[PDB]
Ligand binder design. Sequence first.
Ligand code: ZUF
Ligand code: ZUF
Lengths: 193, 193
Amino acid sequence: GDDRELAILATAENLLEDRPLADISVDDLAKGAGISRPTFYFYFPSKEAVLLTLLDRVVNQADMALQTLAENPADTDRENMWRTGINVFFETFGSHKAVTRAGQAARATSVEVAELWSTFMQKWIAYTAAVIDAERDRGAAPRTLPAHELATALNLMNERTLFASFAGEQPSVPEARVLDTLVHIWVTSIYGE
Amino acid sequence: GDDRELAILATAENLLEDRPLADISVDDLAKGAGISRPTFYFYFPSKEAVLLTLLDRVVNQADMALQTLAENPADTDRENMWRTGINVFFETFGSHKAVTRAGQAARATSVEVAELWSTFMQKWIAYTAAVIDAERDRGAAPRTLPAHELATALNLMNERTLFASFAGEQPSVPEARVLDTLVHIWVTSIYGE
Ligand SMILES: Clc1ccc(Nc2nc(-c3ccccn3)cs2)nc1
Ligand SMILES: Clc1ccc(Nc2nc(-c3ccccn3)cs2)nc1
């Protein structure tokens, strides 16, 4: 039951490490999961639905980790607060690079994947803006740009920069440098001038 | 001769305003250019080659405008220097939104488009880093992050943020706010702390 669905998902994630979604067949997923092709279609309508489910799990994992931080403030300086938050995405998506790469690609071809990513980006931007606003209200950050516009650009920077780093794109920031790089830009732009 | 090639390119750019590359046929391009389909294949091997040529023209237009600025420093403050440079990309790609949108999409499917974008991004990042380094050498900017890593993240931010704005993505910064937003983040991260 749920065991076969999890086996399909585990097989898909393992196969996406080696090749793109277009090079993986339903029979590959069925075979790796130890089921027949018709049995696969009982659990998922398509291989694209499998990827959507994998990406949904990863994005909710990051979202739930961010929620945990939001409820449990670590006792540190403001730079460390932003670093701990950015690290949720660095660690969560960096621990699932194949699903990250395949899910970002599927945004062009799947409206459900595009809508999933858009929904969570809006949530993460709204949370970023709310924290910036709280920093301004307590007098720690200056009232410069509209907080929601600043939050939008910073979150889009992280999306593009983290995923370029994980994919080894040229150009990209080395993965071992990308957290420090992003934290610097967030802290200087939120607290500067 | 060159007149027919330009007619194909003009037709392609006009049609990309209304639909994606996948919804445009060679006969559409031939018909719009006033030539036959076989005559089209004398000038371009495919509709994808037409898009590659259009994107090549746009990216070289931006690159040449940046080169013009690099030779002719405007007499202003440091914030205005970065704003004038970012504006080259805002105006050039924003004046060709359809080719911008279609070219970015083709990066996934065309190695020549991916290599074209990568080559110019590397050039623009190297120039950004060189200007940051010159600002540090003259004592105007602090020695914080490695200049090339900072330049990489800032250029990737601009790519993602400008193109989200032009496409009206959710989420995106409004087009009328995106230049101010990017300039703030560049100036604070280059000169801050
Ligand atoms: Cl891929 C991707 C997509 C969105 C984001 N957004 C982020 N928001 C935060 C954050 C941290 C603390 C408080 C508020 N927000 C850190 S990173 N980051 C990476
Ligand atoms: Cl889409 C895209 C791609 C790359 C960039 N990079 C940029 N470099 C500059 C710049 C300006 C002055 C001096 C050095 N660099 C401004 S914007 N911007 C938008």
